Design a protein around this ligand. Structure first.
Ligand SMILES: Nc1ncnc2c1ncn2[C@@H]1O[C@H](COP(=O)(O)OP(=O)(O)OP(=O)(O)O)[C@@H](O)[C@H]1O
Ligand SMILES: Nc1ncnc2c1ncn2[C@@H]1O[C@H](COP(=O)(O)OP(=O)(O)O)[C@@H](O)[C@H]1O
Ligand SMILES: Nc1ncnc2c1ncn2[C@@H]1O[C@H](COP(=O)(O)OP(=O)(O)O)[C@@H](O)[C@H]1O
Ligand SMILES: Nc1ncnc2c1ncn2[C@@H]1O[C@H](COP(=O)(O)OP(=O)(O)O)[C@@H](O)[C@H]1O
Ligand SMILES: [Mg+2]
Ligand SMILES: [Mg+2]
Lengths: 281, 97, 1544
């Protein structure tokens, strides 16, 4: 039972659902509980004097703000959800979130399309860290955009491929996918001409028939003279296995940005780390 | 007439877009052209070694991020920023080519 | 608790059942039940009314049981009626868009269809009325607001379907099927018009006239889509000759025909159809050109699927599903909702991107979220897409009152009807409301997703969603759209879960050039391309070059207004040329007229009419240079609107205003008036921006009167101060319990205009918002000030703005309004230079010469005085130069021209009244012209001095006097060193020094330092005269100065000279709101309904009520710099009344005037007053008395005091000096910079003299050393008790000794300054000094008795305890003696207070605060204490701790009680009657026979003041004390502060 916090009827529904689930063993999720900091305290006291069913679970989704009571934080286990640390982690999360049966479907090219989608999503989400240069503002390129892009890819591939096991890369509706991602899915958030130009950059560079060649490069001159190579596989597990063997030497050149873009940031955080190590002394 | 030959720093002006509009207006009035049919051309030269014609205005303090300018041509660089010595903004008639 | 509920239920149910006489035919069984209920009700009315006694009816049996049965019956019948309403809403779901009372109105009025014709506008998109035959028995068709009608193929017969729901559903279905059939026929014809080399204009115009505006555009789109599809299917072979060029040429020739058509005169409906067709075919031409350039040869290429394509299948049996609209992979069926004649938008690249994104969102069964800055086309694009699919789109202007329930019911209506909800400003909701609404949105979207599954079949169970604990059917055609301006003020943050439910789209840069080009081309402008390419860069360069002003807007709405005005101007110019040709010759050729037409000149005229009025002075040359550069060689000269100009002249003459043409005096004002008229003609939302007193109000009033006298249409103006009332009182409230809507002020006015019972729609209605503008209240008008012209309320009601109504705002700035409001309003900028000072002088002189002051010899005196003062009121005259110089001085408040000018005018009116009084006093010898001239000139100089420097210090006043002396020619006082400000003007016409009015008085011995005893001083006699002058005119005034400067004393002294005025004290604080004023009005005044309206006047006839506000600048400003109470007072002063929010009625004040007092605005906790408020209130600066004046005032009090002991009579002069010096030193040593409470004023000196006088009253004799000891003890109790630090108290001791030794040399130091200086009246009858040890023993014995009788907590006695109990005993022995003990918790403050109260006989009262303690409990406790201490004559020590406070209302009530001794609104209702009864009983007990309630309430207040002692205890917080100094000012000026601190 999912309940959104904020209204009196919401509090009544939350109380009723928790009271039912602590006996039945069902699950209760409460969303945006940070908007009612006072009620969270009575919720914590109610939870403390309670011996619910074995399978009962209570999830409280919230934003990271100081209004959340400290006692509630101590009473429960905290999980922080944020952008993945790097391109490899982002692509691994993307591949884990999408079901295996979805990627492995009638056309074998769907797996490579999904891999391209994951790489694209990882690149644009990782460029958000270098906010002045990677983009012009902190766009909210998130998981909903990834779902919309996956749905678009599925719909247009199914339309083009009437259940055929294999289709030619030139027959893939590249223009439809590129336009829908540059105008509706990812371009909808973009409110700048130059950010739109950069999105069109990435979409034209990545989504093309040349992405199905063995000589395709995902990125160029990442460090020195080597470059990221497009995997030659045709199955989802092979793409995931390629993602697992990423060098773990990510640089902003992976994103197309200059390598020095992180030099200030990686400096500040480093100093920041010292400060934290000094604050806990 | 002397105000045309001075080089200003666009970052040191409260409203630099007003300066761009004023230079465009000056060029349009000088040549009796229409204001809406003027486009801007950029020529990067040294501050001392430069000449301003009836349509050129000098600008200082512009910084090129991630690129270097040689012979008014841009090349990618690993430097954070490169100081452009002097920039000539020259208003010309639109060609639509 | 049962009778009232049953009574109300029966009343409203009887009203429902009687107003609807046909409701019985559908509700039979409950009709019989209600007949039985009505018979029972008649029985009760026949039984209880016979005996009008409660005891006579509570003795009758069978009453309570029958009442309970009736209550149950009423509840059951109400529930049944609610279920019936729900069931009837289930069929024909459009009834979900009407209220329950409205639904019942249609239910009961099914027989007569005339009453139902006003409900179709809110149940249908474009159906305004239903066409019926003469019998009113069959529905022949439908009609729109524009008059366009659709004739049903098969009319709906009401006789064959009597039930309302059935024939309404049949009407809707017949609407859809008739629209489908007409669309099919129009498509059949336009196909013939298609695939043709040439098009006959006559046949094309005939086809356009034949079909509706919706259907012609739809058919053109269908035909073009079919042609393109056929061409692509032919070209699918690849590398083949393209017939797509044929489609392009067909579009081109049709565009040529349409462009020729719009050049010539057309009927308005045909013209709008032609414009829509031109726009659509221009878009088609652009799309075809893009397809040709891209070499698209496949119909399955995405360059063709990304477009909106229309497929028509005549083979479909269902005409509703006959048309399909497809974009990318999204498919929709045309809703066939009659939309009337809407304004089609230009399909720009952004609009296309918006269409694609929103259609993708719709296919995903999730909402759309277009975001961006204002005027980007976000809302209109959503409406245009909805109209493209034939959907019913409702726009809801959302605010924070759109709670969970309102949004839920809106969603229920949208689900049932199957309509599109465009929620504009969705971020104006609360974040918690956004989170709550996210759940409903998710449920609806999940239901839609389940509907979209192919496994579902329409024959199975319908899809329902859980909405508001109910199963609600969800139509597949539902859509939710939210348009929000991210970053705008008053906007909230959307939760992530809600954001994931919408597909977002950035609409930031509209394609302005394309819109301009297409709009101008559709209006008939030749060379529209060059016009657009000139006018769009012009707007861009205006945005860039012009200065940044808060009222500047050069976005799309500005260009849109410019383009519409350009089209209107072109039509008007064509008509003018036509009539000129008719009067000169007979040859008329419309093609020639179009050919030789100066289109650029028309565009310049439009720009000047729309953009110029808002420009500031420094930006006008820039914009005109931009015009001369962008449009070279063309110039526009504004037409001379003479016919309006003579009307303006006549109105100005009748209103004593100055009129000018061009460069004369007042010409700029007339130009602004004409600009306002043009903006009214072009805009339905206007705003008049400019500094206070720039002539805005007179401008719009004169314009209204001139328009009434020119057009013959009577003009009615409703003026509202939006920030003088709460937003709930402005727009309305929705009851969270009963879902009942109470209209606000603006809502009530608009609804009354719309109903037009008294012919309101036939009048020019102007709703002016004269007040501050902030996004909290003005954004609710967004949909009002947009193309929607609709006010949307949370209860789902939508009110359309009538065409005769203009929404106007009169503001002084827009620094807090967002761009959303700025862009939706035409701005007229009123600089202060528009209204010249000569204009104000002319207005004043004309009013003086015309309007008598008494209500004629008075008019003759006024005319003579005006003639005398005319030479000084000219340009570059005495007054003008004096004002210019005074603007260079320093004033206690911001100096505005009209404040000084109004002060001067009031003083001149007082001078005329003085001359009239002189003439009345001397009937034999009236004042002659020479004496009048001398008096008027000297008084003019005097009034200039007191009006232009009255709010300044002495040195500024002297500087202004010196400047006037240098420039004036009036005879002035000849003293070399005495400033002119020290003189007054005698009625004989000669300067007289003020010192002659200051006599050395001898105050009576028993009246030493009494509250109403004033020692005459120069400032006292000057300020008294000035206040008398300002009060006699009833002009509101403000006294500014340091606390204790004597503002209240001066005001009361001046009012003592006016016996016809009664003063009422109000003490403002940080949380003061107009409800305090309303309570004061309820207590002291009454409302009566005179024939002219409701008038609020004081109860006491013949008396003027002076509402004296103690701290007028304390009330808190909101985050937009507005004090609500200050705006309320400004409205009551400038408009002479306010609005009663009980019934939204204008109440006019009578015999009520306001006086304010305040500390300087630079003082902490004080805010500067609004310039629009300060314009009407002269400000007088009362400074602290100087050493000479203090020496005189307290020297007099000391002599009167020391007259008690003759042997000490010679020590009055030194003692006063010792009083004056030390008080000065401390005032310099301890300032508000260190601690907030370190305030020293003459009030301390009055307390000093009063305390020494009390000490000296009983003594028969006393040596000098004892007098010095008393002086030092009082100095310690005044200057040392509030000190925080030890070093400050050491300084106080040392300098007390130093001052005493300096002023009393030959004294015994030890006998007078034994450091334990203690005084008490416990050991003896008199207040003689007490020894520390004897005092300790006495306190020990009294503490033993205290333990035995009262609280038994043992206490340890040290010296500080003895000092503190002595101080508390000192305070409890004084009238209105309140304490503020500040110290650490557990230090014994409460215990010592209780002990001292027990010793003094006071009854200790402490409020018992708990978790459920509220404001009502505090009010009840306050009533209890007030009754006990004011009616029973019981001395009560009310002990309150800072932790007992749970709200600011606690501090408000306590502040009022501390300052005045009464709360004006505490006793209201039966409580007031009970209080009056007990007060009469108490007065009878005392021995006073009082009859009226006013004097009895005065006696109650006096008793409370004499008895109640409030002891406030709080911990010593740094910021807490500063906060309390503003929340409760009386805690620091009415309470004695004792700093106990921590134990030393
Ligand atoms: N045409 C005129 N000729 C002479 N005096 C005028 C004229 N118009 C206005 N005044 C006077 O000048 C002052 C202007 O006051 P008005 O209320 O019109 O200004 P405002 O800008 O609307 O003020 P506020 O901002 O305080 O509401 C008044 O004293 C008014 O009587
Ligand atoms: N493409 C367009 N063609 C014609 N008029 C347009 C177009 N886009 C916007 N407008 C006009 O500009 C204004 C935009 O209003 P609205 O859509 O409410 O703006 P927003 O939602 O961005 O605040 C309206 O007058 C509208 O008719
Ligand atoms: N001429 C005077 N005669 C008597 N008291 C005076 C005189 N001048 C100043 N005072 C004293 O100054 C104080 C002014 O108190 P109040 O009227 O409340 O001042 P404010 O209105 O500035 O707060 C009183 O103590 C009053 O007795
Ligand atoms: N002088 C004192 N000697 C002994 N106990 C004291 C003394 N003053 C206060 N107490 C004790 O402190 C408590 C009362 O504190 P109270 O007067 O309520 O504190 P506060 O100063 O915060 O009002 C009781 O336990 C009382 O016996
Ligand atoms: Mg809008
Ligand atoms: Mg006004």
């Amino acid at each position: 039972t999912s309940i959104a916090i904020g209204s009196a009827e919401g509090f009544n529904q939350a109380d009723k659902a928790i009271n039912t689930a602590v006996k039945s063993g069902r699950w209760v999720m409460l969303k945006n509980v940070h908007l009612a900091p006072g009620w969270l305290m009575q919720l914590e006291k109610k939870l403390h004097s309670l011996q619910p069913h074995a399978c009962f679970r209570l999830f409280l989704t919230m934003e990271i703000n100081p209004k959340v009571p400290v006692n509630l934080l101590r009473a429960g286990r905290i999980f922080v959800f944020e952008p993945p640390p790097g391109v490899k982690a982002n692509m691994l999360r993307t591949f884990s979130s999408i079901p295996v049966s979805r990627i492995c479907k009638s056309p074998n090219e769907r797996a490579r399309l999904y891999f391209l989608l994951a790489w694209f999503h990882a690149i644009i989400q990782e460029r958000l860290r270098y906010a002045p240069l990677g983009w012009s503002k902190k766009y909210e390129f998130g998981e909903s955009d990834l779902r919309s892009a996956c749905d678009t890819v599925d719909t247009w591939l199914d339309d083009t491929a009437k259940g055929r096991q294999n289709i030619s890369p030139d027959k893939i509706p590249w223009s439809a996918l590129k336009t829908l991602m540059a105008q509706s899915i990812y371009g909808g958030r973009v409110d700048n001409e130059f950010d739109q130009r950069l999105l069109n950059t990435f979409l034209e560079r990545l989504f093309t028939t040349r992405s199905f060649d063995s000589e395709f490069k995902l990125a160029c001159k990442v460090d020195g003279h080597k470059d990221i190579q497009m995997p030659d596989g045709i199955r989802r597990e092979e793409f995931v296995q390629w993602v697992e063997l990423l060098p773990d030497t990510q640089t902003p050149s992976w994103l197309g940005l200059p390598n020095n873009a992180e030099r200030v940031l990686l400096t500040t955080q480093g100093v920041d780390m010292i400060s934290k190590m000094l604050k806990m002394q | 007439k002397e105000l045309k030959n001075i080089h200003v720093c666009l970052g040191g002006l409260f409203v630099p877009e007003a300066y761009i509009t004023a230079t465009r207006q000056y060029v349009a009035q000088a040549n009796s052209w229409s204001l809406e049919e003027l486009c801007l051309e950029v020529n990067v030269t040294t501050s001392q070694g430069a000449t301003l014609d009836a349509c050129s205005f000098g600008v200082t303090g512009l910084k090129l991020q991630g690129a270097t300018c040689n012979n008014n041509k841009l090349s990618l660089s690993n430097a954070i920023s490169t100081a452009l010595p002097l920039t000539q903004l020259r208003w010309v008639k639109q060609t639509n080519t | 608790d049962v009778w009232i509920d049953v009574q109300r239920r029966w009343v409203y149910l009887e009203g429902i059942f009687t107003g609807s006489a046909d409701i019985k035919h559908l509700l039979p069984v409950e009709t019989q039940r209600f007949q039985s209920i009505s018979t029972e009700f008649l029985a009760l009315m026949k039984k209880v009314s016979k005996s009008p006694l409660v005891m006579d009816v509570l003795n009758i049996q069978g009453v309570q049981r029958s009442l309970e049965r009736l209550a149950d019956l009423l509840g059951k019948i109400q529930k049944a009626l609610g279920e019936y309403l729900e069931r009837e809403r289930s069929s024909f779901p459009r009834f979900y868009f009407v209220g329950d009372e409205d639904l019942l109105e249609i239910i009961g009025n099914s027989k007569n269809v005339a009453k139902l014709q006003k409900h179709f506008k809110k149940m249908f998109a474009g159906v305004s009325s239903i066409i019926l035959n003469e019998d009113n028995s069959v529905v022949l068709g439908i009609s729109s607001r524009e008059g366009e009608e659709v004739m049903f193929k098969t009319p709906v017969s009401i006789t064959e379907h009597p039930k309302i729901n059935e024939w309404l559903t049949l009407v809707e279905k017949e609407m859809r099927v008739t629209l489908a059939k007409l669309l099919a026929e129009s498509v059949t014809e336009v196909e013939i018009f298609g695939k043709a080399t040439s098009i006959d204009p006559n046949t094309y115009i005939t086809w356009i006239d034949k079909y509706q505006a919706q259907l012609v555009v739809l058919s053109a789109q269908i035909a073009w889509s079919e042609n393109v599809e056929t061409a692509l299917s032919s070209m699918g072979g690849g590398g083949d000759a393209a017939p797509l060029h044929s489609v392009l040429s067909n579009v081109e020739v049709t565009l040529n025909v349409l462009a020729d058509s719009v050049l010539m005169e057309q009927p308005p409906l045909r013209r709008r159809k032609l414009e829509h067709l031109i726009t659509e075919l221009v878009h088609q031409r652009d799309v075809t050109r893009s397809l040709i350039k891209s070499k698209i040869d496949n119909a399955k290429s995405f360059e063709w699927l990304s477009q909106m394509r229309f497929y028509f299948d005549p083979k479909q049996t269902d005409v509703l599903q006959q048309l399909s609209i497809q974009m990318a992979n999204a498919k929709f069926n045309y809703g066939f909702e009659y939309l009337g004649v809407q304004d089609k938008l230009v399909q720009t690249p952004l609009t296309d991107r918006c269409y694609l994104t929103m259609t993708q969102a719709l296919e995903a069964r999730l909402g759309g979220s277009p975001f961006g800055p204002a005027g980007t086309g976000k809302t209109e694009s959503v409406k245009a897409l909805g109209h493209q699919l034939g959907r019913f789109v409702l726009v809801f202007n959302c605010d924070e009152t759109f709670d969970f329930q309102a949004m839920g019911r809106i969603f229920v209506g949208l689900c049932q009807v199957g309509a599109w909800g465009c929620f504009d400003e969705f971020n104006r909701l609360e974040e918690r409301m956004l989170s709550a609404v996210s759940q409903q949105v998710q449920c609806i979207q999940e239901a839609l997703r389940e509907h979209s599954n192919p496994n579902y079949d329409k024959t199975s169970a319908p899809i329902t969603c859980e909405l508001l604990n109910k199963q609600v059917k969800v139509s597949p055609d539902m859509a939710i759209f939210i348009t929000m301006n991210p970053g705008y003020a008053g906007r909230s943050n959307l939760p992530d879960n809600l954001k994931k439910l919408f597909r977002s789209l950035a609409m930031t840069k509209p394609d302005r050039q394309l819109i301009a080009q297409v709009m101008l081309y559709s209006q008939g402008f030749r060379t529209a391309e060059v016009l657009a390419n000139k006018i769009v860069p012009f707007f861009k360069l205006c945005d860039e070059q012009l200065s940044s002003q808060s009222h500047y807007d050069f976005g799309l709405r500005a260009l849109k207004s410019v383009l519409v005005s350009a089209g209107n101007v072109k039509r008007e110019r064509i008509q003018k040329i036509k009539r000129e040709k008719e009067e000169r010759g007979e040859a008329v050729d419309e093609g020639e007229i179009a050919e030789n037409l100066p289109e650029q000149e028309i565009l310049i005229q439009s720009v000047c009419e729309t953009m110029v009025p808002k420009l500031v002075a420094e930006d006008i040359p820039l914009l005109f240079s931009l015009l001369s550069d962008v449009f070279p060689g063309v110039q526009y000269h504004r037409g001379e609107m003479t016919a309006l100009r003579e009307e303006l002249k006549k109105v100005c003459q009748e209103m004593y205003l100055t009129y000018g043409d061009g460069e004369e005096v007042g010409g700029m004002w007339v130009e602004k008036v004409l600009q306002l008229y043009q903006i009214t003609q072009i805009n339905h939302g206007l705003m008049m921006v400019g500094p206070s007193g720039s002539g805005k109000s007179m401008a719009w009033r004169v314009l209204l009167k001139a328009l009434e006298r020119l057009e013959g249409v009577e003009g009615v103006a409703h003026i509202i101060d939006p920030k003088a009332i709460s937003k709930d009182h402005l727009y309305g409230t929705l009851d969270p319990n009963t879902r009942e809507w109470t209209d606000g002020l603006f809502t009530h006015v608009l609804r009354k205009i719309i109903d037009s019972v008294r012919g309101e729609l036939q009048k020019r209605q102007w709703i002016v918002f004269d007040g501050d503008v902030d996004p909290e209240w003005v954004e609710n008008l967004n949909s009002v000030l947009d193309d929607n012209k609709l006010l949307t309320l949370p209860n789902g009601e939508r009110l359309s703005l009538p065409p005769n109504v203009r929404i106007m705002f009169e503001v002084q700035d827009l620094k807090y309004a967002t761009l959303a409001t700025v862009s939706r309003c035409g701005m007229v900028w009123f600089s202060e230079d528009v209204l010249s000072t000569d204009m104000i002088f002319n207005n004043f002189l004309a009013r003086l010469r015309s309007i008598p002051l008494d209500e004629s010899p008075m008019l003759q005196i006024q005319r003579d005085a005006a003639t005398i003062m005319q030479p000084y009121f000219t340009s570059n005259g005495l007054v003008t130069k004096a004002l210019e110089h005074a603007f260079q001085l320093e004033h206690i408040m911001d100096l505005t021209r009209l404040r000084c000018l109004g002060s001067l005018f009031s003083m001149l009116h007082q001078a005329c009244r003085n001359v009239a009084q002189y003439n009345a006093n001397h009937p034999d010898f009236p004042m002659q012209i020479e004496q009048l001239e001398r008096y008027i000139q000297r008084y003019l100089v005097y009034a200039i001095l007191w009006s232009l420097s009255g709010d300044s210090r002495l040195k500024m006043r002297a500087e202004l006097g010196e400047y006037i002396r240098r420039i004036t020619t009036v005879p002035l006082p000849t003293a070399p060193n005495i400033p002119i400000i020290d003189y007054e003007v005698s009625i004989s016409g000669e300067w007289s020094p003020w010192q002659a009015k200051v006599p050395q008085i001898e105050v009576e011995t028993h009246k030493v330092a009494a509250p109403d005893v004033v020692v005459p001083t120069l400032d006292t006699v000057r300020h008294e005269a000035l206040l008398y002058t300002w009060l006699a005119e009833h002009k509101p005034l403000v006294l500014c100065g340091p606390p204790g400067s004597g503002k209240t004393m001066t005001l009361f002294s001046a009012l003592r000279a006016l016996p016809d005025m009664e003063v009422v004290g109000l003490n403002f604080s940080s949380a003061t709101t107009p409800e305090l004023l309303l309570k004061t009005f309820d207590h002291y005044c009454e409302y009566r309904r005179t024939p002219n309206g409701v008038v609020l006047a004081p109860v006491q006839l013949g008396k003027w009520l002076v509402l004296f506000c103690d701290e007028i600048n304390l009330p808190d400003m909101d985050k937009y710099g507005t004090q609500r109470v200050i705006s309320f007072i400004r409205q009551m002063v400038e408009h002479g009344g306010f609005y009663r929010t009980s019934d939204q009625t204008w109440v006019k004040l009578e015999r009520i005037q306001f006086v304010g007092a305040c500390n300087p605005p630079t003082d902490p906790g004080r805010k500067p007053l609004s310039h629009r408020f300060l314009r009407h209130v002269p400000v007088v600066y009362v400074d602290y008395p100087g050493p000479a004046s203090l020496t005189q005032i307290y020297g007099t009090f000391n002599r009167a005091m020391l007259r008690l002991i003759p042997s000490l009579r010679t020590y009055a002069e030194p003692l006063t000096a010792a009083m004056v010096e030390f008080y000065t030193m401390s005032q310099e040593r301890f300032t508000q910079d260190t601690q907030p409470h370190y305030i020293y004023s003459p009030r301390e000196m009055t307390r000093w003299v009063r305390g020494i006088f009390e000490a000296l009253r009983p003594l028969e004799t006393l040596p000098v050393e004892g007098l010095i000891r008393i002086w030092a003890h009082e100095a310690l109790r005044l200057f040392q008790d509030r000190l925080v630090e030890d070093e400050e108290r050491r300084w106080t001791d040392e300098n007390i000794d130093t001052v005493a030794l300096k002023h009393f040399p030959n004294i015994d130091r030890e006998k007078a300054m034994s450091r334990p200086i203690l005084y008490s009246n416990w050991l003896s009858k008199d207040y003689i000094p007490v020894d520390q040890e004897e005092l300790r023993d006495y306190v020990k014995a009294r503490l033993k008795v205290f333990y035995e009788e009262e609280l038994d907590v043992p206490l340890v006695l040290f010296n500080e305890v003895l000092d503190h109990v002595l101080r508390i005993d000192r305070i409890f022995r004084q009238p209105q003696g309140h304490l503020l003990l500040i110290g650490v918790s557990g230090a014994g403050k409460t215990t010592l207070s209780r002990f001292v109260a027990w010793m003094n006989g006071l009854s200790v009262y402490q409020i018992k605060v708990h978790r459920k303690y509220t404001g009502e409990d505090f009010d009840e406790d306050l009533r209890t204490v007030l009754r006990r201490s004011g009616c029973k004559n019981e001395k009560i020590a009310f002990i309150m701790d800072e932790s007992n406070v749970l709200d600011s209302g606690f501090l408000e009530r306590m502040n009022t009680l501390l300052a005045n001794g009464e709360v004006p609104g505490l006793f209201e209702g039966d409580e007031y009657a009970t209080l009056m009864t007990q007060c009469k009983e108490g007065a009878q007990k005392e021995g006073l026979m009082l009859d009226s309630h006013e004097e009895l309430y005065k006696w109650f207040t006096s008793q409370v003041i004499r008895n109640l002692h409030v002891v406030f205890t709080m911990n010593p917080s740094s910021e807490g004390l500063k906060d309390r100094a503003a929340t409760s000012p009386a805690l620091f000026n009415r309470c004695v502060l004792n700093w106990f601190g921590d134990w030393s």
